[PDB]
Structures are given as C-alpha cells and as structure tokens.
Amino acid sequence: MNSQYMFDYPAINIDVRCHRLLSSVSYVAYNKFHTHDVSTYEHCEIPLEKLRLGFGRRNSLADFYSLGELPASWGPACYFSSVKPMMYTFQGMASDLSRFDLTPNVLKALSWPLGIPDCEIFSICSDRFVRGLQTRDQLMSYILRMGDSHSLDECIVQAHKKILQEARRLGLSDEHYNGYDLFREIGSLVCLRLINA
Amino acid sequence: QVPTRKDYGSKVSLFSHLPQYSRQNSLTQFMSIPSSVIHPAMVRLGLQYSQGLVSGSNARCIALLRALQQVIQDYTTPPNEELSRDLVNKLKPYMSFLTQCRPLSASMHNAIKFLNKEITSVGSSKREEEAKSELRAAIDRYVQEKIVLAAQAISRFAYQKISNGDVILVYGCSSLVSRILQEAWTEGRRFRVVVVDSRPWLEGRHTLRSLVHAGVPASYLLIPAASYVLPEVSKVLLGAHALLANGSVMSRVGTAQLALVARAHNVPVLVCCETYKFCERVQTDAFVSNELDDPDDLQCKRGEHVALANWQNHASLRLLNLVYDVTPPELVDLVITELGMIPCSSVPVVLRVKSS
Amino acid sequence: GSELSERIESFVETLKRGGGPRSSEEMARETLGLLRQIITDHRWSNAGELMELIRREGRRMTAAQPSETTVGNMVRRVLKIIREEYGRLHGRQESLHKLLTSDFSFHYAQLQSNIIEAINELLVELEGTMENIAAQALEHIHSNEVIMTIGFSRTVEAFLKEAARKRKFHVIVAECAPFCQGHEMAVNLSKAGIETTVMTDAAIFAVMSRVNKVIIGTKTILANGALRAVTGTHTLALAAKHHSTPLIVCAPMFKLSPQFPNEEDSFHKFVAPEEVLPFTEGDILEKVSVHCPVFDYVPPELITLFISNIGGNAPSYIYRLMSELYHPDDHVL
Amino acid sequence: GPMDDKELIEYFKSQMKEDPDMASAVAAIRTLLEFLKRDKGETIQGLRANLTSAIETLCGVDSSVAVSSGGELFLRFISLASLEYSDYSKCKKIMIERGELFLRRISLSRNKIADLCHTFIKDGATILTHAYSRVVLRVLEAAVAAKKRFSVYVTESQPDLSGKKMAKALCHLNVPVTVVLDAAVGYIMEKADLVIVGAEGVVENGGIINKIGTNQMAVCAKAQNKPFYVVAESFKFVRLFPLNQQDVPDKFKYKAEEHPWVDYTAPSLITLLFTDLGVLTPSAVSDELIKLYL
C-alpha cells in the first residue's frame, strides 16, 4: 500500500518526572513501508496506529476524528487541504511578543495549554519562523507535550479537543476554529487570553 | 542408543508406508533416568508431543524453539572440536527422537532448517558464550518476526476483507483465525461466525470458547452438515498448516472437502498462513505424505455399546485416522499473508523472495 | 576450422535426415560440445561477434529440424551464459520495477575462459539430471498405486525403476501407435519386477477410471506451461482431467523452450503415411489423404505438476523458470 | 500552491482532447509529472502529500481504474526515487529525468503489444471483441499489415455504443466486421475461433476489470473451450483483490436502474495476457506486483 511508506519515523521519548517538560519526539530515517497508514501535517509524518485514514473534504478537523479518522494531509503546507482553509487573528501580535521571553495575571493567562508558563508558541507563530524539515521535531514535541498520550495522532486529537473547549469557555464560535493550523489556533487563543487579562 | 518405536495395529495397504503409533506406548520407558543420550528438555518435549499435550503448529514450533534454546544454553563445546559441526551433529539425534515421538510439522521443519543455517553460520573464532547468546537472540527474533508481527500484519490485512453483516465459516482450531476474528470484532466490525468441527479431535470447540469470550456471535456444527449451512455463509476463512510450492494447501483433514463444498455453493475461500510455513516440496494427494494417529481414538460410545471395541479381533478390519489433507490451488480463492493479499500461484514467488 | 565445419555439416544432415542421438540428453550434450568447439576454434574479438556467430549457427541447426527444440534451447542457454559473463565482466529482464527505476563491443581476455568453464559446469549438471529426477520418485508413489504411461520415456522409466526398489505398484503402458515404443517400456519395466499391462491407446479412456495418477514424459515445454508430447498425449491428458486424475510430467530442465504456441503448421512432425496406411493398399491410396502427426499439443491447464532436476513446480510458475534460463531478446534467435 | 485544482483539471482535459489516441492513464501520468515539474516545494513529505491530493482530484475527474493505477504507479515511482537519493534537489532532478524516460517508454507500449499479439491471429480466423479498445484496434491493424485475412465480430455495448465506433474504425482499414447485440454473445460464440479483449485494470490475482459485458463473454468462451486473450498495458496493474462482482469498489462501477460500468473477470477464465512486458500467464501479474512493492 502506497499510503504506508514512511520517509522518516517519529521516535517518542517521554520522561515520567514531568510530561509538560523534556518530553520530546525526534525523527529518524525509516525509508520503508510502515505497518500502518501515515498522515502528513507540516511535513510531519504521523503513524495512524490508533486512528484510521479518511477521505473527503470535510470543513473541520473534528469532522474527521469524530468518526475515528484522520485526513491523509491537511494544513497550510498542502496545496489542497482536506479541511477547509481559514485564517486566525492576533498573528501579528504573536510575532510581536515572539521577542518577549518567559521573564502575575500574565503568567496565569499564558500558562495555557501546558499549565506551566511557557512562551514557545510565540516563537512558533513568528513570521521569522519557517516550516521545514528542521522544525518537525520541536512542533511535534509541543503537540505531544500539550496532550497526554504516547501516540502522536491521539495527542493531535486531544490538542484540538482542548482548543475547542477553551474556545467554548471564552465564547468564540465553533466554525471559526476548525483545526486547519493548530499552532495558529493556540497562538490566537493565548493572545486573546493575554489581552483579556 | 534410542530404541525404535513399535507400530501399533494393522495399517491400510495404501498407507502401509507411513508409521502408526499408540498413544499409551511411550518411548522413554526404554530410556535411562536421568536422560543421558537425549537432553532432558527434548525428552520432556517429545513426551508432550506423543501424548498430545501441545497440538497447534505454531505452539509446536514455539515449544521446539524453547527446548532448543534450553539445549543451547546447557550445551558445552568438546575439546578439539568446532561449535558449528558439533552442535548440528548433537542436535540430529534429538530431532530423530522427536520424529519418533511424533512426525514433525512443516513449521517445525522450517524452524529446524533456520536453526541449522544459523548454527552453521557461527564463526569458528567466535567465543562460546557469545555464540550461545547470539543463537538464543536469533531464536527469539525468529519467533517474534515469524509469529507475532506476522499475525498482526495478517489480521490488519484481513480486517479490510471483513464487512458488517457477513457470515464467516471457520474450521477446527487455528490461532491465526481466532486472532483475526478477535481484532476484527474489536475494531468495530459486526458479524457472526460459523464454526465447523470434526471427530475425533474436536479442536473447533476451542475456537468456539474464544469467540464466546470475545462477544462474537457463533454457531457450532459438525463437518457433514457443512453443506446445510453454506447457503447462508458469506465467506470461508481457513487456517493452513503448510503451503506447498504448487499452491496447494496442506491442512487438517476436512479442509479440502470444506473448500470443495464452498465452491459448490459459490462462496469465496480465504486461507490465512504465515510465510514461514511455506514449503518447497510438492504433493498431489494425501496418500504419499501424511500422519497416522492412534486408531483407537476412532472408538465412540454410542448408547451402551462401543462398536469398534476390540476391532483388532477381526482380521480384515482396519481403522484409518488421517491427520492431514491437501486442497488443490483451484479450490482456494485468496491467500492472506504478512506480505499482502496474494493468490495461491504466488506461493513459489514468496519462496523465491524469502530465500534471497 | 575444417574439422569444425565437417562436424557442423554432419550434425545438420543428421538432424535433417533423422536418427543420430536417440537420447535427448545425448543430443543436448552433443549440441553443447559443438557450441564449445565453435567458441574455442572460431576467431572473435568481442561479445557481439560471438553472439552473432552463435545466432547464425543456431538458426541453421533450428532450420535443419524445427521439431528438435533441444538444439535451440542449448543455443539460447549458451547465449544467456555469454550475456551473463559479459555483464559480470563489464557492468554490474523486463518488470515494473525496472520500468520505473530506469553494448557488447568491449573486449576482454578472460571472457572466453569464463564462458568455457560455465559451459563445462552446465554439462556437468546435465550429466546428473536423470538421477536427480529419479531421486524424487518415492515422494510421489505410494503403496499399491496404479500408474499410467504412454510411449517410451527414459526419464519415466528411471523414475519407476527407482520407485520400485522400495514400493509395489502397477504400471499401465499404452503403445504409442504407430511406432509402438510402449512395448519396449513395458518389457523393460517387467524385467525390473514391476507388474505391467500392455494396451492400445484406444483403451486410454476406458481404464482411466481405475488409474491413480499419470506420469508421462515430453519432448518440449512451452513458455506458458504447454507440452509438445508424443501423439495421443492430449487424449490421455483430457481423460485424466475428466476424472481429476493428477498428471505428472517428468521432464528435465533442458526441454524448456521460450517459444509460445502461436506457431502453427510446424508444431507436429509429419512423417510418411506408410506408418498409418501401408503401400500395399493399392488403388484406394490415390484418393485418400493420410496424415501421420508424430507430436501433440497439450494445454497447460491439463498438467498438474512438473518434476525436474530442481524439484517440483506448478505450470503457472514455468514462466519464471523460463525467465531464469533465457534472455527475452534471444527468443527470436 | 502552484497549479491548483482548476489548472490540474484543465491540463488533464487538454491532454485528453488534444490527442484522442492517448489513453486516460497516460494523460493522468503526464499531468502528474507536469505537476511534478512545477511544485516549488522543499520536502519530499509535502511533495508526496500534494501528489496524493492531485491523484485524488484527478480520479475525481475520471472514475476509471486506469487513472488510479497510474496514480499508484507514480507514487511508487516517487518512493523508489526517494529511496536512492536523500537530498531533495538531486532527487527531484532524478525524478524529472526518470519521469521523462517513463513517459517515453509507456507512450510506445501499444505498438509492442501489437507486435507481440498479432502472431496469435491466424488466416481465416474469426475474432470476437467486446467493445472499443485502442489496443485491440492496433493489434488488428498490425495483423492486417501482415497480409492476414480474418473476420471480426463486435458487440454494440448498449450503455454507450462504442462497439459501433469500433466497427467503423475497423471498416476504415477494410476489415470484414459484424455488429451483434450484447445478448448475442452466447449465440455467436460457436462461430468465433478466439476472443480478444482489452482491460481498464489488471487486478492482483491476474483477473481484469473491463466493460460491463466482459464477464459474460469470458464465461461463454470458457463454456465452449475458446481461448480468451487480454491486451493491457503495464500501467494498468492494480493491487486489488476482488472476491466477487460486489467486491469491486463503487468508485469504478458508477459515474463513468442499476447500471454498473465495469465488471471483474477471474484469472481462471483468461488464457494469456499481452502486455509490454510480453506474453504472460495471469500468475505473472502477482509476481510483478510483489516485486514492485519490495
């Protein structure tokens, strides 16, 4: 099956002492057919060990994992996206505080989604940041650390679920958060929480 | 040395070239205690082989490989000798004794060939403990790759061929078939299973229990009534003891008959088998190569009288207990292996790519 | 030079006039020896000249007697050996893999020695073919079996003689009319203690219901698994298929020909009508058409198993063996 | 990104319309390679995902088995090329070169099939065909050029009368041809000497996916001991294993009362297959597919 070939494999290392810190995923050469299907997001290969491959052009990412499936490829990196493309606010603001480091209410507001204050999403959403082969490890590690699972696909599903939960809490509409760019959603939510308090 | 097991009863003329033993008559009664000419692990393994304490082909292969690991662990090299030759020459009588206890299965033969190739490949300059550890690791890796990952891949492949609301007919006991059905039910497929069983082993009951413990609806019947149930059957799924170079399926007796009756009812036939059970030999019928079990197992108590009791009193009476049969490749629609979905005619091709 | 030319002319005339080497193995050995002498004596610089010379000689021998496929098979085997040696000494099949993932003028001094040693190894393997085939007799014959044969096949005779050393069975031999060579097979098998029956081909169907399996030889094996056998073998195969009786072809690997059954009107060998209708019939011979085909075409679907020096195989795998022996560019020759 | 869905569909349709002789699979492979030419990507993962989406939308344009076969073959070609070169620039150059060579090789498969298949046609033979097929037309042209005389029967193919088009194309080169109903397959089988058909897709076990009326003709030829030959190109080798007619994917049956457009023919009903690889038994297709995928 052509959909099972893997150029690189994500090796996950999880430390028991703290899941939100030092838990990482590296990428190693595979160059062979994997046992399961593969999903592509921002040049990142996710094995579909717990979810199944899906097809179509559904509007939201939730429309896929609500059926226990994941799209073959979605996000800005792909020319034609299974999810409906959309834009999020406060991207320029995120690029602005990309220079700001981790150094009261602001810390509690920015503690999301890890629960421990962090400012990596600002560097993620910065305009100087470019997506390629060198940024797979850090982005996938952030996704892994945000969720609580040993599988990347489950971590992505949980990340989108918590994004939707925070959007419900803050009163934003569901249709404006579909999962096209998870990290842009995280940055927009963090910026909204920061400006709120 | 090791004495020769005595044949029991009178054999059919067409099957006079095959051995036929008695379950009660063991060989270790003529062997020393403690065992000296035969390693104790091999003695115990042959004892459970002859008594039928382990029966499945995968189970027999796993037990043989564990006993071989124990023998290699307990082995020591003799002065002025080489590991590669001495180990094989020492293992040969153990395999002869095991064959005397019960004829070796195809998976057992393939495992023996693999282990002999691995032992012959051990370098002379290699240290004894390093060589033993490498052999044990090779045996463990062989078990892992050829059984567990192969079964997982076969189940993943067979999930795509199982749909909601279909009827799957299974025969006897096969770990691969039960595993496939269990994962298919687990992932969310909804179906029912029809279990076919035959005397005197009645191994199918085993599978039935597994299905009952998995929540899968199941039905039970004997092989002669199979033609009654195939009209409602959507597909037939069969395990295989071996796949031969001509594409024929060597399996438990009654498999070829079930395939023929399914063909008469226009239902697809799928055979699941790991690639390590593929054999280079060919066989056109069940007469040239087969196993003769204990004829006394055919005796059944129907009412208050056993008609086959003291059957050896009648000079012309013979009791035939065939173990295996051969299904021609034209009676099998699909073969499921860890390599993918292939036809029977592709069996030699796999044999070409696995060897080199 | 002159001696090689005389040998080639004698071989061609013997093929044209019939007779010569009765055994197929003997004919293969003579063809290999002739090709080796051609390679040694004739002058060539690079692989291309040698291949063209071998192609011309093989074309001549094949045109001498098209029904003798062993000579052409040997020529193509030698050509494939030359190609393999040149590729091994110079560089480092058509498939989807080759299609997706993307010159014999060079001269080498040691190429000739490699070709000669490969030919010698091929001859050595050829010498032990019959024993290799016969060593598998016990795996296919059980006690008190009934075997049916047609004509006189030396490979089948060796098979049955080896099997009879340890098992008792019955053999039925059909006399391949008009040249009733089955009588020689029957008397030879009876001399070895095997119980044998002599019958005509007209009874092949009648007794087929009491036959356990059929073991036959062949003259040629086609690329699709079809057989060029003695006449009457198609009827025997049809009768065996009617009763689902397994049919075993004991044929060495050197009888495989990469040709296909597309060729017509040259497949069967037509001989003088005297074998079928004697000249003493008289006037009625003026207005009667008499045809005596020697060979018959057997479709691959009527064959159960092929037993060769490399083991047992299904007909559906024959192509792969044909891919391992001959280059696709040498089929036309 | 570059060349969105509209441009891809336009290029595919333009390639199909400009050269009506070119098959759908060849046009799809050309569109995929010309997409590969201008991608402006830096990673092989995004390239693979973009090519997969392009194949998805192309199969959305045309519901034929051959388009999907070409898409899978192109994906395997990309994976094989990536396996040898790690750097993306060198890999892309090698992919472009190998794709040009692949297009050149697949553009002349029809002539090879004709030259290898016309020998099986005898003088005075009666050829039975099912529907319109460029490969069958080419093999009959090659047989005619060999100064051979034969007659051809063709069914009308009721859904779309491509049999009439085949009959006119055969009359163009002065070939005695006859048009029969789709219900006259069994009636006329006894008069035909051999049957030659095309195939939209060759499945793993050696069977074929073809026009809706192929299975009837194959079964009728089997019932009367008539040879059944299939001419098909290499790029139509699909890794599909249907068990019956219902097991064929629905994306190929419809949109191309109950009116399926294709059917499956088992390998046991096929005598030989004529491909650019040569004359093969149905068992060789599975070997080829196994060798391709490691």
Side-chain angles (χ1 to χ4, degrees), chain B residues 258-315:
Chain B
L258 262 164
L260 178 84
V261 182
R263 164 67 43 85
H265 285 75
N266 207 225
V267 353
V269 168
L270 293 76
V271 166
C272 56
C273 189
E274 306 96 332
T275 58
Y276 92 104
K277 279 164 171 192
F278 286 14
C279 303
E280 309 265 4
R281 46 174 268 263
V282 289
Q283 186 176 350
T284 59
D285 51 72
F287 290 79
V288 281
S289 167
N290 210 313
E291 185 191 318
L292 285 178
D293 220 305
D294 201 19
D296 289 27
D297 290 354
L298 295 194
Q299 300 172 3
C300 67
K301 180 143 160 12
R302 285 319 174 249
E304 276 299 312
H305 185 222
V306 185
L308 285 195
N310 313 120
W311 60 271
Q312 281 137 303
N313 289 346
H314 319 85

Side-chain angles (χ1 to χ4, degrees), chain A residues 90-91 93-95 97-98 100 109-114 117-127 129 131 138-139 142-143 145-146 163 181-191 194:
Chain A
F90 303 114
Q91 303 313 315
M93 182 190 166
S95 331
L97 318 87
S98 69
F100 279 78
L110 73 88
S111 279
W112 206 72
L114 270 64
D118 83 298
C119 67
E120 211 75 24
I121 188 66
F122 299 125
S123 174
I124 289 319
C125 300
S126 63
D127 298 336
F129 178 84
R131 269 124 170 183
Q138 154 174 165
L139 279 279
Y142 190 103
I143 282 293
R145 278 176 307 110
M146 163 177 350
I163 283 191
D181 198 331
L182 266 281
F183 315 97
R184 290 227 185 283
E185 309 206 291
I186 293 281
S188 74
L189 285 181
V190 157
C191 281
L194 228 44

Side-chain angles (χ1 to χ4, degrees), chain D residues 263-279:
Chain D
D263 62 355
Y264 155 71
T265 283
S268 56
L269 298 164
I270 292 160
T271 297
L272 291 158
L273 281 101
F274 297 93
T275 82
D276 46 291
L277 305 181
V279 182

Side-chain angles (χ1 to χ4, degrees), chain B residues 165-168 192 194 219 228-235 265:
Chain B
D166 66 344
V167 189
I168 298 125
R192 43 182 283 238
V194 165
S219 301
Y228 163 75
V229 88
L230 267 159
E232 78 210 49
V233 166
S234 96
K235 40 184 49 74
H265 285 75

Side-chain angles (χ1 to χ4, degrees), chain B residues 53-69:
Chain B
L53 292 181
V54 294
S55 269
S57 38
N58 280 333
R60 283 174 87 192
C61 186
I62 285 157
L64 169 72
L65 292 167
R66 295 293 169 247
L68 283 157
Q69 263 176 320

Side-chain angles (χ1 to χ4, degrees), chain C residues 94-102 223-224 260-264 301 315-317 319-320, chain D residues 73 77 80 98 102 105 112 119-120 122 234 237 276-277 279 281 283-284 287-288 291-292:
Chain C
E94 209 175 17
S95 56
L96 282 168
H97 195 113
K98 204 74 110 206
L99 164 67
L100 284 188
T101 88
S102 63
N224 59 333
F260 269 106
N262 60 51
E263 233 287 339
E264 207 188 18
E301 66 255 28
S316 62
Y317 202 58
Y319 77 101
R320 173 66 199 193
Chain D
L73 200 59
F77 151 79
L80 286 161
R98 284 184 183 182
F102 182 52
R105 277 190 289 257
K112 301 163 80 68
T119 317
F120 278 75
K122 299 317 178 151
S234 282
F237 283 14
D276 46 291
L277 305 181
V279 182
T281 43
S283 58
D287 183 17
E288 280 297 323
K291 281 184 295 159
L292 183 59

Side-chain angles (χ1 to χ4, degrees), chain A residues 23-25 136-146:
Chain A
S23 200
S24 61
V25 47
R136 297 171 304 167
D137 307 38
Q138 154 174 165
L139 279 279
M140 279 309 110
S141 165
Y142 190 103
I143 282 293
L144 173 74
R145 278 176 307 110
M146 163 177 350

